[PDB]
Design a protein around this ligand. Structure first.
Ligand code: 1FQ
Ligand code: NA
Length: 358
């Protein structure tokens, strides 16, 4: 029996149903663009469960006993079995609004509202947007356009490792006891990513020292000429607040969204140009006692996190977010030194990071 929850499934990167899930992911993305939250969620849960299968679907009989597969989803699977393609996903790929939204939001600093605004102005290409003399761009969008080609190219593991070295070298200069962990997709075993994310924590730093680290590290990189873009969001973390009730919980830890200059010489790969590459990097600083909750939240995937929080609420009467775990029956906050302890508190078998690709 396959569970309806991604947190009770092992989802590895050997996806045997990419033909089905690529189509479901496109339909889910279109429903996000069309602001249809419900239809989006149904396609995301169906795609997620098929990603967990240890075999490819080759007939409709193979879908028996699989949860999260409604009639609409089963019609899409049937169509792919029939001709090897999804007519529904093909129509989304050829839709002008979908194409514009994907293209415009591929720029760093451009979200749903700006993409919609540009579309309703009649823009269809990034060339026409950039060269327009009436348009006004945010500092984030300026960086997004300036380093577009580098940011649209996939970050590989030798590059992520080169960034990790830079992060660790800068961090230990100001906090020598600090623990730096690469999170996101690369922690889950992915070969590529659009960015490189890190969690930083220190067992001996004060509240002030931990607040100043991201400012010190970014000033050091600015001095070294490696900081191409920097936005530091101060913490809004509340030590004694109950965890979030929301479907998608907000992270209140101090964080920064960066673009770093990665010199080619620092990358130790199998393999020209300007000799450097712009890399999107996110840094998160958390208090030492909350490191397991933050690690669990930042490792992902987004679907794994949604189902973890849904399972905690609906099955265990517990409240989980990136900062804490609260037991509503015992009326106590639950402590954890590792992700394993969080899973044990929830009554879940431990799911390895490479098994969280839901
Ligand atoms: O790629 C996926 C998900 C899909 O692939 C899928 O579910 O199918 C997410 C990975 C992921 C999530 C993040 C965040 O950026 C993040 C996390 C918490 C937060 F509060 C703010 C930002 C880092 N790891
Ligand atoms: Na964007």
């Amino acid at each position: 029996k396959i569970s309806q929850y991604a947190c009770q499934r092992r989802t590895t990167l050997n996806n045997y149903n990419q033909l089905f899930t690529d189509a479901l992911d496109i339909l889910a993305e279109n429903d996000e663009l069309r602001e249809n939250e419900g239809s989006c969620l149904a396609f995301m849960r169906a795609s997620s469960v098929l990603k967990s299968l240890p075999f490819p679907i080759t007939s409709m009989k193979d879908t028996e006993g699989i949860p999260c597969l409604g009639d609409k989803v089963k019609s899409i699977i049937e169509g792919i079995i029939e001709d090897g393609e999804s007519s529904e996903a093909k129509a989304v790929l050829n839709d002008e609004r979908y194409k514009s939204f994907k293209l415009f939001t591929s720029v760093f600093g451009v979200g749903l509202k700006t993409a919609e605004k540009w579309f309703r102005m009649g823009f269809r290409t990034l060339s026409k947007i950039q060269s327009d003399k009436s348009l006004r761009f945010t500092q984030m969008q300026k960086a997004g356009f300036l380093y577009y080609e580098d940011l649209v190219s996939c970050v590989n593991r030798p590059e992520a490792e080169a960034v990790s070295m830079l992060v660790k070298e800068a961090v230990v200069t100001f906090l020598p006891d600090a623990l730096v962990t690469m999170t996101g997709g690369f922690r889950r075993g992915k070969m590529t990513g659009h960015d490189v994310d890190f969690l930083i924590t220190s067992p001996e730093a004060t509240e002030d020292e931990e607040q100043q680290l991201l400012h010190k590290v970014t000033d050091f990189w600015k001095q070294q000429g490696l900081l191409l873009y920097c936005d530091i969001l101060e913490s809004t973390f509340e030590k004694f607040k109950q965890p979030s009730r929301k479907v998608d919980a907000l992270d209140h830890f101090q964080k920064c969204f960066l673009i770093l200059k990665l010199d080619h010489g620092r990358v130790h790969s199998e393999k020209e140009g300007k000799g450097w590459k712009a890399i999107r990097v996110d840094l998160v600083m958390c208090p030492y006692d909350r490191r397991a909750f933050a690690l669990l939240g930042w490792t992902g995937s987004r679907q794994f996190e949604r189902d973890l929080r849904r399972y905690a609420t609906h099955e265990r009467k517990m409240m989980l977010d990136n900062h804490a775990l609260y037991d509503r029956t015992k009326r106590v906050f639950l402590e954890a030194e590792s992700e394993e302890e969080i899973f044990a508190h929830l009554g879940l078998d431990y799911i390895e990071p490479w098994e969280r690709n839901a």
